[PDB]
Structure 1
Amino acid sequence: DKPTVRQPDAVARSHLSDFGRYVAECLPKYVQKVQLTAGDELEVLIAPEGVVPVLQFLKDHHQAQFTNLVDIAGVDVPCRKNRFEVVYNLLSLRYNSRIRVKTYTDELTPLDSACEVHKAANWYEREIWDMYGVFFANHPDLRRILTDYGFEGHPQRRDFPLSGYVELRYDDEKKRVVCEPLELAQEFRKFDLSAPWEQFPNFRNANP
């Protein structure tokens, strides 16, 4: 027996596999790929034109009441052609389950706002807009929610620096908090924590 290895839940595997084949059968227009990851989590990989009609479907069907939307997450992967991906995590209280709906979006290409489906997307879709520049069309008001009012740029992209571009200091000549180009007293020491030997042989050919 192996007590240091997490045992997967089979009743969260079979139900999620049957539901993944079910949602692939019910929506062949938008759903490209459904996958059951390690850790018993189901991912649906939709087209960017199907953000609203998939998240509406999982909201209102009898066999899928994913009525709760917990978080909308943006991941910036600059290697890909469409660099941003947007992940909608949905919780189903009736069937006691979770789903993740992932789509790909570029900064210039807009995305459908899920605010008509779930009202939590009134704010979460602002936050990605504050941090990646993913424009969400047909939004109630798409404003800047977390960064400063005079901030220029989206900070959580991987092409943005860690320490930012500018700093703030009080100027007693102008009697106000002015903006200066960045000069750190001690620079950020970039540690080269790269593994020269591969440790996972199961992920060697997982890219095709």
Structure 2
Amino acid sequence: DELTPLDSACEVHKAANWYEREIWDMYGVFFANHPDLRRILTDYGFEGHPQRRDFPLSGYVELRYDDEKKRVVCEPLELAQEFRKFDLSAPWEQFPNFRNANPP
């Protein structure tokens, strides 16, 4: 879950070290015994883990540049053209084989 931690493969395969950092950044799945759980991809001071499916595609904030402050500031989101989804849902079940198979 999003709360309980998870075992670390750093002690098993040295290859995984960066991956655990990646999932931690991208989902928030803690890893126990991981040497250093620093974020990898997202920028510094980024709040939330975007790869979750309860996270808006465009994020909550976006950056610009200030002249009063000679610096780049994060601002609430503001989109020139709101991302137009398309509802691509099948009305007709195209696959019977998976219908009742794998039931509880």
| TM-score, reference length from structure 2 | 0.96
Structure 1: give runs of 5+ residues left out of the alignment. 1-105
User: Hey, what's the Cα distance between the residues in 2 that align with 1:175 and 1:206?
Assistant: 61
User: For 1:46-87, what per-residue CA distance to the aligned partner results, in whole angstroms no more than 9, with x for missing partners?
Assistant: xxxxxxxxxxxxxxxxxxxxxxxxxxxxxxxxxxxxxxxxxx
Structure ranking higher in strand proportion: 1
1:172-208 Cα deviation digits (max 9, x unpaired) = 1111110000010000001000000001100001333
Aligned to 1:112, what secondary structure does the other structure show?
coil
Matched residues in 1 for 2:83 and 2:51: separation?
17
Cα displacement (A) at 1:121: 1.3
Distance in 2 (alpha carbons) for counterparts of 1:206 and 1:160: 31
In structure 2, distance between residues paired with 1:152 and 1:185? 24
- What's the counterpart of residue 145 of structure 1? 40
- Which one is further off, 198-207 or 133-142? 198-207
Q: Aligned with 2:72: secondary structure?
A: strand
Alpha-carbon distance, 1:152 to partner: 0.5
CA root-mean-square deviation: 0.8
User: In the comparison of the two structures, how many residue pairs are matched?
Assistant: 103
Distance 1:141 1:206 in 2: 43
Q: Output one character per residue of 1:142-170: Cα deviation in whole Å (capped at 9) or x when no partner.
A: 01100010211000000000000000001
CA distance, structure 2, for counterparts of residue 120 and residue 172 of structure 1: 45
- Provide the rounded CA distance (Å) in 1 between the counterparts of 2:57 and 2:73: 21
**Which residue of the other structure, out of 49, 61, 71, is the alignment partner of 1:166?**
61
Q: What percentage of aligned pairs have identical amino acids?
A: 100
Write out per-residue CA displacement over residues 4-26 of structure 1, whole angstroms, 9 at most, x where no aligned residue: xxxxxxxxxxxxxxxxxxxxxxx
* C-alpha separation in 2, matches of 1:168 and 1:200: 45
Alpha-carbon distance in structure 2 between the residues aligned to 1:167 and 1:152? 12
C-alpha displacement of 1:108: 0.6
C-alpha separation in 2, matches of 1:155 and 1:120 = 24
Aligned-partner SS, 2:82: coil
> Which portions of structure 1, spanning 4 or more consecutive aligned residues, are displaced by more than 6 angstroms?
none
| Greater relative contact order, per chain length (Cα 8 Å cut-off, separation 6+) | 2
Q: List alignment gaps of at least 5 residues for structure 2.
A: none
